[PDB]
Each structure stands twice: as structure tokens, then as C-alpha cells.
Amino acid sequence: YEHTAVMPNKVGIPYKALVERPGYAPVHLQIQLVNTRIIPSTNLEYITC
Amino acid sequence: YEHTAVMPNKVGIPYKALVERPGYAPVHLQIQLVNTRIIPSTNLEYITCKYKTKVPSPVVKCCGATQCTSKPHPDYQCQVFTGVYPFMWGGAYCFCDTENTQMSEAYVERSEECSIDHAKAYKVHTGTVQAMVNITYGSVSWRSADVYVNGETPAKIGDAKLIIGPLSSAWSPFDNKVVVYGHEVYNYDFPEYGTGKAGSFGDLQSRTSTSNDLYANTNLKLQRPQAGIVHTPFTQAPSGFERWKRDKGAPLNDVAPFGCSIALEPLRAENCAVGSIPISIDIPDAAFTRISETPTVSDLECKITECTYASDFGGIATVAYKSSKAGNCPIHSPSGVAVIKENDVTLAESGSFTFHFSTANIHPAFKLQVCTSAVTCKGDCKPPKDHIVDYPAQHTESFTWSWLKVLVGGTSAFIVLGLIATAVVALVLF
Amino acid sequence: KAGSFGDLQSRTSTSNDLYANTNLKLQRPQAGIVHTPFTQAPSGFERWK
Amino acid sequence: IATLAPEPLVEHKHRTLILHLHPDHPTLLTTRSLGSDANPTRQWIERPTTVNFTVTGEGLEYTWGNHPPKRVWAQESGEGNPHGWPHEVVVYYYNRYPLTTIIGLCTCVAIIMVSCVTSVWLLCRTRNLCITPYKLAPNAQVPILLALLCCIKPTRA
Ligand SMILES: *[C@@H]1O[C@H](CO)[C@@H](O[C@@H]2O[C@H](CO)[C@@H](O[C@@H]3O[C@H](CO)[C@@H](O)[C@H](O)[C@H]3NC(C)=O)[C@H](O)[C@H]2NC(C)=O)[C@H](O)[C@H]1NC(C)=O
Ligand SMILES: *[C@@H]1O[C@H](CO)[C@@H](O)[C@H](O)[C@H]1NC(C)=O
């Protein structure tokens, strides 16, 4: 039942998928990507002023 | 109503057949062959174990010879020796220098471990297999009885009389010759009592533990003690019981076929799932319910709702029960396609009650006999995801058409088109 | 994965939080004696050396 | 008071146990494919090793040292035969039967080649015929060429 799901990157809205496990009752999702903060790899090269 | 039934040999799962006695209400079975312990016919041929060169203390004649004799001890190795000067606590003690004689003697004897830590050979014949068959029968709901396989033995434990086998699957996982060790059982071609080459398995060969006589081919060869000192060089192969514990083969409870477990207990080979068993029972007629007391269920409907194409009872199906009275109703699929968890379903006046089951064909077209009312629970099933736990309840795999029916009918249509092209040439010909 | 490299995964040395997939499975102590069966993969830092 | 080897890491695959494994000491692992084909295995494992076991339909058992013997249902996991495509989803039926489908398909490929060449002869011979009665008279006024339409071109009659 490991519910793989392609999923649009968009922040402020849930994505209520559905678990179709064969055998037991299905269960809904509610996946809201509340944030997409990134934090790339960087380097402080020089301050200027 | 003596319900004969061929029945697969497989241990840990019931076999809920259905008694179709003409005249009274049918009754379900629940036959779970909880065990398949075997206990072949055998013979203790010889214990073996590692020797102990329990040297008798050598003679030392000081001036002249001491002829040895071949005492009857097992592998009584004895060799006279001269040319010593035996340092014993005061330097030497025998005042001669070549007439100093030393007679070394050593025989083989069972270790103290031979009583307890010992391999054990056997000539193994077939014997007769057993089982603690539970039947939580009908409304009886219980009997857990030990039975046999030979096809005329009853066992009237509970209320039902039941005759089992003989099974068709005569594979004794034991070979003819077997060695046994504590719990690890080895289907080994042990050489024999009386013969075993030294170093090889069975260098010591005692009939039993008590048996003072034995066969000890250990290649025990005494050598002369060194430089005029008292001791006993015994040059000997460490036992073929020493090896056979660290250069051995693997155990039959780890290399057998067709699914067996083992014990150093009556020498059974438990739970050997293979083949079928022609089982037949004589139910107590008192346990029957007459037909005019169970609800008639016809004018019903059955359908799957979430069929799981699987082992665990994932298949389900509602049934639009259309009863006459209200009560219980034993159920079974006479087709082996579907195996059902529920033996019995309770019924109000024409309600609906889902049951659980398991199948192996994508389109399970299995009949369901709800207490004398058949129905096809046709449908379609879904594969699962999560397959690493013990053994199934399905055990019904067979041949399981989307490109075969009109395909091969189409394949035929090419060659069917032939003899309607040919012999129409005969018409154009005339 | 436990046993594999990075069974323990701490952000840094100070970081009290971490990820420890070690497959640590406690078993019951034997025959009425005080002790703690911890059944565990020696680390993927033990191997990797 | 005696030995025990650290628990295994069970990993699923299609009728196959990957087992990343990591003992304390050399551990004799062994199994018994419970078919009447036993096909057992033995190997002392001291070095951590990801191993594999072709589990069958009916079951296998697994003995991580003197840790008790495990057991495993490996029925399918290759998804049977649902259907909404033409044939690339039939791999599901192949992935469950990669012994009988290779021959069962080649059988299905064979019989169509049988049904091909038999259809070749019992068309082309019968196309060679029904023109030999017709295209030898060569006027041959019969507009029921419309039964072969592989040997063609009447004479406007
Ligand atoms: C008879 O066939 C049965 C097939 O399932 C099995 O019998 C099982 O025996 C168990 C022990 O007697 C029962 O467990 C107990 O059930 C009660 C009622 O549910 C619980 O209160 C108990 O806690 C529970 N015991 C434990 C230790 O959990 C099973 O209920 C019972 N099976 C059924 C269906 O009732 C056996 O396979 C077989 N009996 C044998 C071989 O003795
Ligand atoms: C499966 O295990 C075997 C070891 O017998 C190995 O050779 C093979 O690469 C493994 N396959 C995997 C991990 O996909």
C-alpha cells in the first residue's frame, strides 16, 4: 500500500489522494505542501559595502 | 453420508468441505491437518561417538622381555618395546640399559560423551504417518484427535468416525540409511557397523551405549616412548565423530524436500506437505439438522465487492440472502477455486452478509453453496503488494483468456478457411 | 539502511537529533534474569572501515 | 546460555527475498524451498552480505543462525493480468510464468506460423486453383472472381 503519487509542486492547497489498498477500507490523503523552501548550496565569496 | 474426500496434504490450514447428505440439512467440515508426523519403521544399528584412548598403564620389566597378548578389549593395540631407561622420579629405575623392557597397551573405549553426545545410525523403512487432526466440526465445534493414515483406521475421539489415507505421496524424506545427532538428522550413507574406516565416520561403532563390544577401527598405533621416559605414544586418528561435527553435511530439517521438520523424539518428520489424502468420515447423524429447519436461501444474489487475487482471505463478496426462516446457513465453494474463511453465516429474514475468501484466478467463477442453494460469485480480483509472511490459505493454483479465445479461434480461422477454400475448388471444379 | 553505511546519521556532532536505522530489536531477557537483549546490526561505520 | 545472531533485514521483491544481512560472527544460513524440489542452500556468513533467494509459489523457510526458522509466502507480485493496453501489460502474465509463457507464447507463435503456412498452401494452391479453371480459357466469362481477390484481373467479362 506504499502509495506512490506524482504530485504537482504548488504550495497552498491540499492534494487529497486516496489509498486504494486491496483488502481493507481505503483512506484519503490530504497533502498540503505548505512550503517549498529551497536552500541551495552556496558560498560566501565576499561581503561588500 | 460417509463423506469421502480427496484432500491435499498440507498442515496448517482447514479444508472446509461440505456434507451433501440427501434428505437433511448439509453440514460443513473444518479439517485442519495440524500435523503430519511420520515415524517410519527403523532400527538402531549402532551408536557412534568419539573414542577415548583410555590407556591401561604400561608394564615395565627392568631386565628382559615381557611378551604381550592380544587381550579382547576393542581394538586392543599392544606392542612390546625394549631399549628404554625410564626416568621416573629418581632418574631411571631399571638398572639394565637395553634389557629394560616396556610393554605399551591401549584399547579403544566409548567416551563418557558417547552416552549422551553421540551420532546414531539407522536403517530406515517407511512406517506409518500420523496427525493431531482438529475438526471444529459443524456445531460440535471441537475435536483434536491423534489419528493414522492407513485407510481403514478410525479414531472415535469426539463423536465422529474418520478414516484417513493411505496417502499417495510416499516420499519418505528420510533415506534408507540415516545418521542422527541430538536433533540434526542426516540422511547419510553411514558405512556400517563393524567396518568404518578410521578417521571416517563410525571409527567407533557400538551397537548401543550399554554394549561393551564394539568396532574400533581407529588405526591406533602405539610407538615407543622417547629417551628412557615413562609414557605411552598413542598415534591415532581423532574420531570420525570429531569430524562429522565440523566437516559434516547439512541437516535434513535444512535440506529435505517437500516441506518437513524433524525431531529426536519418535523420529518423526513433521508437517510434510505433499500430495493428497483420500479422507472419509462417518458423521454422527444426531449432529445433522434436518432439512426442514434450516432456512431456504434461494432467490438470492452474490457478487464480489473487493476481490483480492491473493492468499490471505482478502476476497470478499456480499450475498443478497433471500431466506425463508432465519438462522444459520453453512457455506462452501464446492469448486476448489475459492477458499472461504467462514464455514457458517447467520441469517435474518432475507438480509445480506459478506464473507471472506481467497482465489487464484483473475475471474473467479466459483459456485457457492449456501446450505442447499448454489450461486456463481463471478467477478474480478486485484493483486496485492506485501508478500513476506508464512504460508497461504489459497493453495488452489491452476490454469488461469484475453488473447486466447478469439485469438486461437482466429488462429483456427486461417486453417478453417482452408478446407472451405479447398473443396470449394472441388465445386468450381465440379 | 541499518548495517549499511550511515546507519547513524547525525547532521553534526552537536546535533542531538539524528537518524538511526539500526534495526535495533530488543528481545526478552532469559530465564528470569535482569539484562537487556539488544539485537542490532553493528554499524555501517564499523564496516566501511 | 547460547548464541543468537542479529536479526535480518527483510526486503521484498517479486518472488525473491533480497536480504541485506549483517551478523556478529560466522553464521550458517540455510533454507529449504518447500517444493518436492528441495533446492537448499548453505553458507557460513561472517562478512555482511546482501543475498538473494528465488522463493517459489508455495513457500520457503529461512534460518538466521540458531534464531528460529522463518517462513515466507511468495505468491505473485508482478500484477497478474489487468488489461487496458494491447499487449505490453501481458508482461504481468509473463512475470508470473517465466517458464511456461516463453514456450507457451512460442507455442502460440508456432501455431500461427502453422496456421500461416497451411493458410498459404490452402489459399495460394486454392488461388492457383480457381484461376486454372478460369485463366486457361482465357475469355472465361465469370464475374465471380470475387471469392479469391488475390489472383486478379478479369478480361472485362
Ligand atoms: C482447532 O482448530 C482451531 C482453528 O483455528 C484452532 O483452535 C484454536 O485454539 C486456540 C487455543 O485453544 C484458541 O485460542 C483462544 O481463543 C479464545 C477465543 O477466541 C481466546 O479467548 C483465547 O485468548 C485464545 N488463546 C490464546 C492463547 O490466544 C483459538 O480460538 C482456536 N481457534 C478457533 C477458530 O477458535 C486449532 O488449530 C485447533 N486446535 C488444536 C490443534 O488444539
Ligand atoms: C542477488 O544476490 C546475489 C547473491 O547470490 C547477487 O549475486 C546478486 O547481484 C543479487 N542481486 C541483486 C541485489 O539485485
PDB file of N, CA, C and O and ligand atoms in Angstrom, chain D residues 13 16-19 43 49-53, ligand 2:
ATOM      1  N   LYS D  13      10.991  -8.513  -2.982  1.00  0.00           N
ATOM      2  CA  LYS D  13      10.951  -8.369  -4.426  1.00  0.00           C
ATOM      3  C   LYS D  13       9.994  -9.417  -4.974  1.00  0.00           C
ATOM      4  O   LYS D  13       9.409 -10.205  -4.227  1.00  0.00           O
ATOM      5  N   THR D  16      11.131 -13.062  -4.665  1.00  0.00           N
ATOM      6  CA  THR D  16      12.550 -13.003  -4.381  1.00  0.00           C
ATOM      7  C   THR D  16      12.762 -12.232  -3.094  1.00  0.00           C
ATOM      8  O   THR D  16      12.235 -11.127  -2.935  1.00  0.00           O
ATOM      9  N   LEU D  17      13.537 -12.818  -2.190  1.00  0.00           N
ATOM     10  CA  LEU D  17      13.958 -12.163  -0.960  1.00  0.00           C
ATOM     11  C   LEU D  17      15.352 -11.609  -1.161  1.00  0.00           C
ATOM     12  O   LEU D  17      16.333 -12.349  -1.080  1.00  0.00           O
ATOM     13  N   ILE D  18      15.452 -10.306  -1.394  1.00  0.00           N
ATOM     14  CA  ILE D  18      16.699  -9.639  -1.074  1.00  0.00           C
ATOM     15  C   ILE D  18      16.785  -9.574   0.434  1.00  0.00           C
ATOM     16  O   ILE D  18      15.792  -9.308   1.121  1.00  0.00           O
ATOM     17  N   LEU D  19      17.972  -9.833   0.951  1.00  0.00           N
ATOM     18  CA  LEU D  19      18.217  -9.781   2.381  1.00  0.00           C
ATOM     19  C   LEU D  19      19.578  -9.137   2.577  1.00  0.00           C
ATOM     20  O   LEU D  19      20.604  -9.803   2.435  1.00  0.00           O
ATOM     21  N   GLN D  43      25.509 -21.499   3.587  1.00  0.00           N
ATOM     22  CA  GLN D  43      26.738 -20.718   3.550  1.00  0.00           C
ATOM     23  C   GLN D  43      26.949 -20.062   4.898  1.00  0.00           C
ATOM     24  O   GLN D  43      26.067 -19.353   5.394  1.00  0.00           O
ATOM     25  N   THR D  49      26.486  -9.287   4.006  1.00  0.00           N
ATOM     26  CA  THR D  49      26.243  -9.616   2.614  1.00  0.00           C
ATOM     27  C   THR D  49      24.767  -9.478   2.306  1.00  0.00           C
ATOM     28  O   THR D  49      23.923 -10.019   3.025  1.00  0.00           O
ATOM     29  N   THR D  50      24.470  -8.765   1.231  1.00  0.00           N
ATOM     30  CA  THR D  50      23.145  -8.796   0.645  1.00  0.00           C
ATOM     31  C   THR D  50      23.038 -10.040  -0.221  1.00  0.00           C
ATOM     32  O   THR D  50      23.796 -10.201  -1.182  1.00  0.00           O
ATOM     33  N   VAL D  51      22.096 -10.914   0.121  1.00  0.00           N
ATOM     34  CA  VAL D  51      21.916 -12.189  -0.561  1.00  0.00           C
ATOM     35  C   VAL D  51      20.577 -12.198  -1.272  1.00  0.00           C
ATOM     36  O   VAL D  51      19.821 -11.223  -1.216  1.00  0.00           O
ATOM     37  N   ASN D  52      20.277 -13.309  -1.935  1.00  0.00           N
ATOM     38  CA  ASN D  52      19.046 -13.441  -2.685  1.00  0.00           C
ATOM     39  C   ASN D  52      18.556 -14.871  -2.604  1.00  0.00           C
ATOM     40  O   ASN D  52      19.335 -15.805  -2.405  1.00  0.00           O
ATOM     41  N   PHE D  53      17.243 -15.025  -2.737  1.00  0.00           N
ATOM     42  CA  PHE D  53      16.605 -16.331  -2.656  1.00  0.00           C
ATOM     43  C   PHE D  53      15.413 -16.330  -3.594  1.00  0.00           C
ATOM     44  O   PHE D  53      14.439 -15.611  -3.358  1.00  0.00           O
TER      45      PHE D  53
HETATM   46  C1  LIG E   2      21.195 -11.185  -5.545  1.00  0.00           C
HETATM   47  O1  LIG E   2      22.080 -11.911  -4.707  1.00  0.00           O
HETATM   48  C2  LIG E   2      23.173 -12.493  -5.438  1.00  0.00           C
HETATM   49  C3  LIG E   2      23.987 -13.289  -4.446  1.00  0.00           C
HETATM   50  O2  LIG E   2      23.814 -14.687  -4.632  1.00  0.00           O
HETATM   51  C4  LIG E   2      23.990 -11.406  -6.134  1.00  0.00           C
HETATM   52  O3  LIG E   2      24.973 -12.022  -6.956  1.00  0.00           O
HETATM   53  C5  LIG E   2      23.093 -10.521  -6.987  1.00  0.00           C
HETATM   54  O4  LIG E   2      23.841  -9.425  -7.502  1.00  0.00           O
HETATM   55  C6  LIG E   2      21.931 -10.008  -6.154  1.00  0.00           C
HETATM   56  N1  LIG E   2      21.034  -9.200  -6.973  1.00  0.00           N
HETATM   57  C7  LIG E   2      20.502  -8.011  -6.637  1.00  0.00           C
HETATM   58  C8  LIG E   2      20.875  -7.446  -5.295  1.00  0.00           C
HETATM   59  O5  LIG E   2      19.752  -7.411  -7.397  1.00  0.00           O
END
